[model samples]
Target: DLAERFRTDGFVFPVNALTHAEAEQALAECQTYLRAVSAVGGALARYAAFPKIHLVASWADRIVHHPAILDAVASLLGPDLLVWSTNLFIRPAYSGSSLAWHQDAVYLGLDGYQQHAARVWVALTDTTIANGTMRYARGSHLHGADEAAAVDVLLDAGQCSVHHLAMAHASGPNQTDTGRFNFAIDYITPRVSPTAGEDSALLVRGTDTGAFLPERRPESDFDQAALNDFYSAVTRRQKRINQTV
Candidate 1:
């Protein structure tokens, strides 16, 4: 009953979703690759953007398979799951920019209404109240894009938040001296997918129903050949998912 209530409420913020070293590794990867992708003058996490990281790095690979994260995911999502997507949310310091209110469930276009998709956001930097973390409309997950009574999160480095895909969410600008960085995993049940003509997945925990074709993992760190393929597919999918939507 409590597990159901917790899931019903989008769980608590900062659920100890990743280890400090794991968070360190993610921040390192973000600081490394994100710079190229125009993230916070950051590093490689810029390169580890959606549809790209899972296929290209051991660090990205390892985090999804982490026992703790999988353990939580199994409870909210299911025993059988596939990691269909990853995304990096980068708020460069002093950008004065924020994401508009939107439901990721709508953008993702998955098929279920009740807790079929969950996102795990692992923080890479101090996301304090002063630095601009995330805000939520409590119990908004119980209904559609509901208006809010506000409460915001102040997640520290390495902590994480898990939320239902449909939970009403929005963010504000970073007011601090440094950028805010966090990484996410979109865990989906086999019954749903991103969109038409989009199907590739990594089995994080359970039996595969073969709904998604196997995703290829990198042979070594930052394999250039694999990186090229990752870039091409993501860029291509931009138009594909939009047009299909």
Candidate 2:
């Protein structure tokens, strides 16, 4: 029934993602990264909303496999999972940071069959109409990118929503006085590569979707070596999107 609802609405949401304590810890970790970037007079220099950030932050890998999130993801992907990419999106109150209408399938390099791929958005702060939350084009999954209607979904701290990779959606630009931030982790199943002719995603759970591969989380924390890897991962994905743009 829940999965049925997800199929109809193009998303399922407010799933209890992290505990209050975990939420606090994640928030602290985020601020710490921001501070690290700011320490050198660089604001959001480490990562600004897109990349394979888990390479530099061990905190990311642990969250990628959070039990509750995996439960939700399983409903869509049927058990086998791989984390292809992850990003930290921050809505600075005055920054007007928002995403335009788009589909993840195109950006994420899925074969565009419109199944077996999803994004689990980990809400680190409360989001509302007042502060720019996500808006989905409900039932957008039923048709191609040409037919989709967008509607905003308000979210609370520690909550998350799961949606298909091809579902058309976008977020409102922040217009409030407080910053809103969250972690968005990308997951895929089987044979899905970062790009055509590239290596497939690293398996996260269950068995192989087709054939599978293993991925390693950062051994520790951010350092020059880890940062280099992080840079490469993000750049590669962006190249895919930029090619489309």
Candidate 3:
């Protein structure tokens, strides 16, 4: 199973998993805000304040709901899956926003390797030399933890990478004048047990057995109601922004 490989090597690539049409549609939706940010001098504050930024929500939801993505999750986590969280990262041209070296598990308040969690990053546009692309440390995801940090990994333009539950990685700086935009969707399985087995334990748990569990399973599957509510919330929030000609 890919999950087992993820445990051994912190990263994996399911090539051509996303269709060109899907990727193009996502990019089209993102262009509305990307162009707006470009017109406003590429300011991070201005881009964040843009009214049309709601496009991010639509793109994010679309990517999360993508069938290929769902299928991949189902294969890795079984028929039961839950959407944990979503993070939108946009690097505009000359914004100078760069993520430092770190592990995804470090920020997530979960313990052990048995935790069935996965991160899906969708590139809204062609990440290129001019734009900031993500980098990975080959099989660095297999490396237990980054107790002794080493070098940084850099990814090419228009490329997307996924790290295992406890994989450590960082994003490079947007050296070009145009901004690079990407969205990350995280999912996990419900009904996980602490003493289930070696592969069933959260990645962090394999690192430390004494770690405590967080909350119990919320549902057998992703809560569609919550996703709808979030969609509505973002739509309403974008209504008040002023559009530039």
Candidate 4:
């Protein structure tokens, strides 16, 4: 039923993946990382820590490997899954920052089988219309990337929404009093591989088909080895996307 709903709508929300308590804990971890990065230099510097954070942060690593999340993802992409990447979208209250309508597949460099991959967006705090919850184009995945035909789904702190890779989505500026904190986990089946260049993925379930090199998890927070891997992976990802642009 979950997979069917996602197929018809291009996205499904209000999936209870975490309890309120767990979500609060997750939010605390995210805030901790946010401060850690911001203090390192300033605002811009913190963005460098947003992608693939699970590779260098034990708390993020824990979230990526959470069984509940993996189970939900498996229903869409199969039991054999790889965590392709993780990202944090933290928009401060009353900020003008917003994401334009776009397809995640536009830059992911994955082979064109969009159905084989999905992104699980976990709400660490209430994601309401006033706080810039994502708006998705219904059944947009059935067509190539375009624009409009959108619907927004509000989620509680512990809930999550899953969407197809090619689905068109966007978010407007946060108008609420508090900041919006959301974490997205990109998951793919071993059946797919990067369209160009080498890529790495962490196998979260079943067998790996060797479609991607195995990603190593952090031994501890900010482990040097994992940090090196994270940065290199980020560079490689951007390089592949650059070729298409």
Best-first order by lDDT: 4, 2, 1, 3
- TM-score of every candidate: 0.83, 0.83, 0.59, 0.91
How well is each residue in 55-81 modelled by candidate 2, as lDDT tens digits? 677677678878888888887777778
Q: lDDT of each model, Cα atoms only?
A: 0.68, 0.71, 0.49, 0.79
TM-score for candidate 2, residues paired by index: 0.83
- Model 4 residue 68 CA deviation (Å) reads 1.0
Candidate whose TM-score is highest? 4
- Residues 184-224, candidate 4, lDDT per residue (tens digit)? 98888887868787777888898775668888888987667
Each candidate's root-mean-square deviation in Å? 3.6, 3.3, 10.9, 2.4
Q: Candidate 1: deviation at residue 219, Å?
A: 2.5
Please identify which of the two predictions, 1 or 2, would achieve the higher lDDT against the true structure.
2
Instruction: Show where candidate 1 strays beyond 4 Å.
Output: 35-48, 105-108, 143-148, 193-195, 228-236
The digit string of per-residue lDDT tens for model 3 on 136-214 reads 5555655355435432323332334555655656666678866676767665665432232111111211122232222
- In angstroms, give how far residue 24 of model 1 lies from its true place: 2.7
Q: Is candidate 1 or candidate 3 better by TM-score?
A: 1
lDDT tens digits by residue: candidate 1, 130-225: 666777666667654344665676676877778777666778888988988877888877776556565566777667745566566677666886
What is the Cα-based lDDT of residue 204 in candidate 1?
72
